[PDB]
Amino acid sequence: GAYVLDDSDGLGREFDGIGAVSGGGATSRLLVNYPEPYRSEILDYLFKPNFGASLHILKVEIGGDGQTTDGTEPSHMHYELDENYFRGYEWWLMKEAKKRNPDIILMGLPWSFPGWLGKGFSWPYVNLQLTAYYVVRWILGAKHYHDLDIDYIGIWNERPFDANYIKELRKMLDYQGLQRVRIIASDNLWEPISSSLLLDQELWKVVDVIGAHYPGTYTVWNAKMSGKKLWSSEDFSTINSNVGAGCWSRILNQNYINGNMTSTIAWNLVASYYEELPYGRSGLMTAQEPWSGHYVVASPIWVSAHTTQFTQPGWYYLKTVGHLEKGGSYVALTDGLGNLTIIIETMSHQHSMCIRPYLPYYNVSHQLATFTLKGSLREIQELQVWYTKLGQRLHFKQLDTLWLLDGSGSFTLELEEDEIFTLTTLTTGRKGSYPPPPSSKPFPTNYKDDFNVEYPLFSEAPNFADQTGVFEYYMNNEDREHRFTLRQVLNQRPITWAADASSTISVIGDHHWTNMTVQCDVYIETPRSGGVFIAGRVNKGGILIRSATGVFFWIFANGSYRVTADLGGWITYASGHADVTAKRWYTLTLGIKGYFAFGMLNGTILWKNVRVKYPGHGWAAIGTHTFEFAQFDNFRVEAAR
Ligand SMILES: *[C@@H]1O[C@H](CO)[C@@H](O[C@@H]2O[C@H](CO)[C@@H](O)[C@H](O)[C@H]2NC(C)=O)[C@H](O)[C@H]1NC(C)=O
Ligand SMILES: *[C@@H]1O[C@H](CO)[C@@H](O[C@@H]2O[C@H](CO)[C@@H](O)[C@H](O)[C@H]2NC(C)=O)[C@H](O)[C@H]1NC(C)=O
Ligand SMILES: *[C@@H]1O[C@H](CO)[C@@H](O[C@@H]2O[C@H](CO)[C@@H](O)[C@H](O)[C@H]2NC(C)=O)[C@H](O)[C@H]1NC(C)=O
Ligand SMILES: *[C@@H]1O[C@H](CO)[C@@H](O)[C@H](O)[C@H]1NC(C)=O
Ligand SMILES: OC[C@H]1CNC[C@@H](O)[C@H]1O
Ligand SMILES: [Ca+2]
Ligand code: NI
Ligand code: NI
């Protein structure tokens, strides 16, 4: 079949860019403590122009101290009157992105909120001005402390919006001189935001972009009618195998074709979280071993390149895009400066399945496509060619330049299945490369941290992935034997996105660990009612954190201890009395081998040969009984898998 590409009677919609999400939750957690040069190479693969993924857009979670899928992320306001714009790693990531690409688009979106915003209720719309104050302070802080211009602000990730809040947010933004900041809504479904915009004139004026999640390449009529920009503000979320790459390739094309969506943002940016956490390895690439330095430049990186390296925000789709007769699709974009980019995909059904949604079988076969260039695209003589084959795979390999010497302005390709072609008048394409990273090693079977860092670059010790609550470096200037510790700093349950545990917890190590000995110095700050624990064989985290089983060694300031099989403390292995009070350092040791475990207090056996379920595996962990202050020091673990 012949497919005409032409700009004679106008253009399509303005292309807004391809991006990815860091956050929801703690997806970039393990990236920060990568040794150089590896950490910097990974960021180059993601954000350096004309190199790797070359992303146009970076979206980050505005941490609200709650569990938001693979962990918690710290807020800039743990408490009322608290301001701190140097917690976590999203500030750092955004700055790294801007250094490589100054034109990158920055977006922020809340998943959860600090509990104090709710004023007693678990609800961010009790005081609209207060919640707006919180969010806008985050944007101001981004500019004032990090020289970051946030381009787009969201509402509440995959949660109900309040129309009056969106309006108050706009007023708050303009009042602080942030008119340039745009609002995207509602980062959930097409409805009810689409119909709300049609029914409410004032709401229409304050919303700039309608952003839907996992729309299956389609939109809805009311969204078209609004005349707003339509984005797939969160998509993908599939394991970065060849299959996930196929999913990414197909939806990148068909989101605009089928659904008029001029931007697609993948969750997540990079899989830098323990793979056994929910949705493991669902990033554009993988970097889940800072201890070894090993990272995988997965195929979605090069799938992205086919569009990102040859398109920029401000470009325009041609009116002439669509599906191929024998399956697959093609899009075409111009910059208005005589350049032209053509992106063609022929992903088979079996090799492009996304998790959300899963498409009914469709068929793709061998085919010939003849592209004819009419209008101002006529005097194009030469097209650079880029090719990718997923499956016995090869990625982003430049092919021999294509020539249109005969004035027909036409060419012809044979398109097999699971293939990508990018045809462009751009000469800047490059498959970036670095020397291959170290091989993958397990988490060190012998690990220790004394948290003795006087000027930490980040707010938390490495490899500790908070799954409920928030743990930070802490300096106590008056105590010398525990001058530098790790502290759980939440004192009330957040306005939650997920089902956070009722106890705080941070996991670390190797999920495949079976036999282990965990030791840590603990400090209970709350008299009478306070409590802490250490644990091994913790099998679940993330949005499943309340599900976590394992062996949990608790001690309480009322002079007692418990040994449970679950974080929720419903199943008892052992319990009894102990010489434990608040505001006093203790050394807890927990040993687990096979069917039996023992617990030590200051090097003395508290319980021994206590029967636990076996087989069983999981991480090591520390935590507190509730959302309460407590300190930890001299963490050690020895384990075997
Ligand atoms: C949104 O995109 C759709 C295509 O998915 C446009 O609907 C028509 O699509 C057919 C092909 O199925 C084209 O031949 C028509 O030209 C399209 N309509 C028009 C008016 O051109 C639809 O127009 C788009 N809606 C927008 C841009 O608001
Ligand atoms: C295609 O795009 C390139 C890159 O933007 C254009 O080249 C730029 O042209 C502007 C003037 O319009 C110059 O200021 C830049 O220095 C150029 N950059 C580069 C890298 O060449 C180019 O004009 C466009 N058209 C064609 C036919 O290449
Ligand atoms: C964890 O400890 C258990 C308990 O000792 C180990 O299981 C034993 O392993 C030895 C050596 O292979 C066998 O001779 C025993 O018959 C096993 N007993 C049971 C009850 O399984 C287990 O191998 C250890 N696992 C690791 C990874 O070190
Ligand atoms: C898919 O399409 C080709 C040609 O159109 C046809 O030969 C083939 O049998 C089809 N296969 C299935 C499983 O539908
Ligand atoms: O598919 C999983 C994703 C859905 N949307 C929010 C993300 O945090 C993540 O949970
Ligand atoms: Ca210390
Ligand atoms: Ni300021
Ligand atoms: Ni497991």
Ligand 1 atom closest to Cα of 257?
Answer: 5
Catalytic residue annotation: 158, 234
Q: For ligand 2, is residue 527 a contact (CB within 6 Å)? A: no
Beta-carbon contacts of residue 523 (< 8 Å; ≥ 6 apart): 482, 485, 532, 583, 584, 585, 586, 630, 631, 632, 633
Instruction: Sort residue 181 into left (φ over 0), alpha (ψ -120 to 50) or beta.
Output: beta
**DSSP symbol at 543:** G
Q: Provide the CATH topology of domain 57-232.
A: TIM Barrel (3.20.20)
Radius of gyration of the chain (CA): 26
Helix 128-146, helix 90-100: angle, nearest 10:
50
Q: Which residue has the tokens 């510790």?
A: 485
Residue whose CA lies nearest to ligand 1 atom number 10: 322
Ligand 1 atom closest to Cα of 227?
Answer: 28
Give the residue extent of every domain in the chain.
1-56+233-441, 57-232, 442-641
H-helix segments, 290-420: 300-308
Query: What's the CA gap between 445 and 426, in Å, rounded?
Result: 50
Burial of 405 (0-12, 13-18, 19+ CB in 10 A): exposed
CATH superfamily of 1-56+233-441: Glycosidases (3.20.20.80)
Ligand 1 atom closest to Cα of 12?
Answer: 27
What's the gap between Cα 100 and its chain centre? 19
CATH superfamily of 442-641: Exo-inulinase; domain 1 (2.60.120.560)
Query: What's the CA gap between 117 and 495, in Å, rounded?
Result: 8
Query: What's the CA gap between 332 and 179, in Å, rounded?
Result: 33
- 3-class SS of residue 242: helix
Beta-carbon contacts of residue 102 (< 8 Å; ≥ 6 apart): none
Question: Binding site membership for substrate: which residues?
Answer: 69, 111, 157, 356
Cis peptide before 186 (omega within 30 of 0): yes
Taken in order 388, 389, 395, 397, the sign of the CA dihedral is: negative
- Termini Cα distance of the chain: 57
Q: For ligand 3, is residue 593 a contact (CB within 6 Å)? A: yes
Ligand 4 atom closest to Cα of 363?
Answer: 1
**DSSP symbol at 513:** -
Taking every pair of Cα atoms in the chain, the longest distance, rounded to a whole number of angstroms, is 92
Query: What's the CA gap between 375 and 377, in Å, rounded?
Result: 5
**DSSP symbol at 316:** E
322-354 core/surface letters (b: 16 or more CB in 10 A; e: else): eebebbbbbbbbbbeeebbbbbbbbbbbebbbb
Query: What's the CA gap between 611 and 599, in Å, rounded?
Result: 12
CB atoms within 10 A of CB 381: 11
CA-based nearest residue to 514, from 618, 608, 443: 618
Cis peptide before 268 (omega within 30 of 0): yes
Q: For ligand 2, is residue 425 a contact (CB within 6 Å)? A: yes
What tokens were used for 235? 């998509």
Burial of 448 (0-12, 13-18, 19+ CB in 10 A): exposed
Question: Binding site membership: which residues?
Answer: 69, 111, 157, 356
Beta-carbon contacts of residue 429 (< 8 Å; ≥ 6 apart): 50, 305, 309, 310, 384, 386, 398, 422
Centre of ligand 7 from the C-alpha of residue 104, in Å? 22
Centre of ligand 6 from the C-alpha of residue 38, in Å? 28
Residue whose CA lies nearest to ligand 4 atom number 14: 363
Burial of 543 (0-12, 13-18, 19+ CB in 10 A): buried
Decide if 498 contacts 113 (C-beta within 8 A).
no
Burial of 382 (0-12, 13-18, 19+ CB in 10 A): exposed
Centre of ligand 3 from the C-alpha of residue 442, in Å? 20
Cis peptide before 141 (omega within 30 of 0): no
Centre of ligand 2 from the C-alpha of residue 426, in Å? 9
Decide if 589 contacts 570 (C-beta within 8 A).
no
Q: For ligand 2, is residue 338 a contact (CB within 6 Å)? A: yes
What's the gap between Cα 363 and its chain centre? 33
Which ligand lies nearest to the CA atom of residue 321 in the structure? 1
Residue whose CA lies nearest to ligand 4 atom number 1: 363
Centre of ligand 1 from the C-alpha of residue 137, in Å? 41
Q: For ligand 2, is residue 427 a contact (CB within 6 Å)? A: no
Q: For ligand 5, is residue 421 a contact (CB within 6 Å)? A: no
Which ligand lies nearest to the CA atom of residue 310 in the structure? 2
CB atoms within 10 A of CB 281: 18
Q: Which residue has the tokens 């195929």?
A: 299
What are the distances in angstroms from CA 556 to CA 519, 525, 626? 17, 11, 11
Beta-carbon contacts of residue 177 (< 8 Å; ≥ 6 apart): none
Helix/strand/coil (H/E/C) assignment for every residue in 138-199: HHHHHHHHHCCCCCEECCCCCCCCCHHHHHHHHHHHHHCCCCCCEEEEEEECCCCHHHHHHH
Please choose from 13, 260, 319, 324 the residue to mutate so as to test ligand 1's pocket, defined by most ligand atoms within 8 A of CB: 260
CB atoms within 10 A of CB 611: 11
Query: What's the CA gap between 388 and 343, in Å, rounded?
Result: 11
Query: What's the CA gap between 535 and 518, in Å, rounded?
Result: 7
Can 1-56+233-441 and 442-641 be said to share one CATH topology? no
Backbone φ and ψ for 184, nearest 5 degrees, come out as -110, 135
Ligand 3 atom closest to Cα of 514?
Answer: 27
CB atoms within 10 A of CB 283: 33
Decide if 390 contacts 245 (C-beta within 8 A).
yes
- 3-class SS of residue 460: coil
Decide if 368 contacts 293 (C-beta within 8 A).
no
Query: What's the CA gap between 588 and 631, in Å, rounded?
Result: 13
Centre of ligand 1 from the C-alpha of residue 152, in Å? 27
Q: Which residues pair with 163 in a beta bridge?
A: none
Q: Which residue has the tokens 């993948």?
A: 266
What's the gap between Cα 365 and its chain centre? 35
**DSSP symbol at 366:** -
Helix (H) or strand (E) holding 236: strand 229-236
CB atoms within 10 A of CB 146: 16
Pocket around ligand 4 at a 6 A CB cut-off: 326, 363, 365
Taken in order 489, 493, 495, 496, the sign of the CA dihedral is: positive
Q: What is the DSSP track for 244-291?
A: HHHHHHHHHHHHHHHH---EEEEE-S-B-S-TTSTTTT-SSSB---TT
